[PDB]
Structure 1
Amino acid sequence: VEPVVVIDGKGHLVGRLASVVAKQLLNGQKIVVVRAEELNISGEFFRNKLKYHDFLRKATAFNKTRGPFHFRAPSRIFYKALRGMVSHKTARGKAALERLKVFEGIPPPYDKKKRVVVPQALRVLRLKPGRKYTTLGKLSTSVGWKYEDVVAKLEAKRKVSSAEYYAKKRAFTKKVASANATAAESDVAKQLAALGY
């Protein structure tokens, strides 16, 4: 329905978000993920942090370079989870992965475009109340990520100047509502209500 879907990873589960996005990728739908650094994983910090180290151990017994290497960026962590859910090493899998983009925060021009969320992957709607959860930001920093401060610092600048845009939009909508409200009850407006509009 949307040529390019932008998904906000904040408050989502990596496994649920990755699985949902993975199927869409195989279906030809292009998807972009933003604010990956704010993505969350179930369980308290120790379990998530401990499991990441265990995976790092089995990289390669003899030579890490002649094998896999560990990406510290939160986006790569999500990409690794999504990569395992796609038939990599194949033309269909490789082509599907090319339709996916992941960035920390909301780099432009996506900042000026609407972003959606997946209702069936939100932590609020999936995790039991009162249970502990882990955030990729702390996990990524604990494993050597050196850009958490930069992302947080410039993300506030993203948060700023957006409320101003909404503030102008909110005032503009107020004028539209007043213009629409006064125009209501007219002959055309009254007839429209009959047809449900």
Structure 2
Amino acid sequence: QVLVLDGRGHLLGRLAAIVAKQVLLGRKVVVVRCEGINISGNFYRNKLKYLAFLRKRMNTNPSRGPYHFRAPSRIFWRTVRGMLPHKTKRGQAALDRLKVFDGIPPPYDKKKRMVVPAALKVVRLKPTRKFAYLGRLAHEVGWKYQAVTATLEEKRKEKAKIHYRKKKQLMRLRKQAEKNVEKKIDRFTEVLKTHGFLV
């Protein structure tokens, strides 16, 4: 009942608009691996844009000024808040519904995550154009925990590789069992495929 999205390979604003629209309608959305998000344009242009955003600060008391969050997850949260009416109660509730994580935590590391083709780089961006990784931008703008997140993600990738090997072995065993047992379930697969299955 909760959307789980993989931030890797998605465009920043393209994914943020969809996430904001979904979370306005009461849908709970969780986004993982926000460092995998990539923004169109060259990295130097994106870095200059974020440096201008940093330069935007309250002159008399910067403590009250804009809060420039460096973590990619908080950057995505802020760009969704910029599309949400955060001044109102409905906007605040949508922000509370939305959850963003750096990398992918154990609460969601063992959950299948959806992919939005309407915000993917390969879908919406020409292959001859350049793009900048949000993780690289965050690291060069002030993020601290890039290497730790990378190591934890590598450990999770190894564990998921082991799990996928086990699942693939299970599927191969299931195929062998089906091949060995089809004689006594011929009358079931037949009625299954008469209606458009297993074909």
Is the shorter-chain TM-score for this pair beyond 0.5, marking a shared fold? yes
Stretches of structure 1 that go unaligned for 5 or more consecutive residues are none
What residue ranges of structure 2 are gaps of 5+ in the alignment? none
Greater share of helix: 2
Matched, 1:72 2:70: yes
SS of equivalent residue, structure 2 residue 118: helix
Aligned twin of 2:114: 116
CA shift, 1:196, in A, is 2.2
Whether contact under 8 Å (2:40, 2:130) holds in the other structure is: yes
8 Å contact from structure 1 (residues 9, 35) kept in 2: yes
Q: 1:130 is matched with which residue?
A: 128
Kept in 1, the 8 Å contact 2:118–2:124? The answer is yes
**Match for residue 193 of structure 2?**
193
Q: Tell me which of 126, 137, 140 is aligned to 1:139.
A: 137
- Give the alignment partner of residue 146 of structure 2, picking from 130, 145, 148: 148
Q: Is the 8 A contact 2:56 2:66 kept in 1?
A: no
Secondary structure of 1:31 counterpart? strand
Q: Which residue of 2 is the match for residue 45 of structure 1?
A: 43
Partner SS for 1:89: coil
Using the size of structure 2 for normalisation, the TM-score is: 0.94
Q: Secondary structure at the match of 2:62?
A: coil
| 1:21 counterpart (19, 26, 35) | 19
Q: What secondary structure does 2:66 align onto?
A: coil
Residue 10 of structure 1 aligns with which residue?
A: 8
| Displacement after TM superposition at 1:190 (Å) | 2.0
Secondary structure in 1 aligned to 2:63? Answer: coil
For 1:108 and 1:83, the matched residues in 2 are separated by 25
Find the partner of 1:85 among 83, 86, 95: 83
SS in 1 for 2:115: coil
RMSD: 1.2
Percent of counterpart pairs with the same letter? 57
Structure 1 residue 182: Cα displacement: 3.4
Distance 2:192 2:83 in 1: 50
Which moved further from structure 2: 131-140 or 57-66?
Answer: 57-66
Structure 2 residue 34 is the aligned partner of structure 1 residue 36: yes
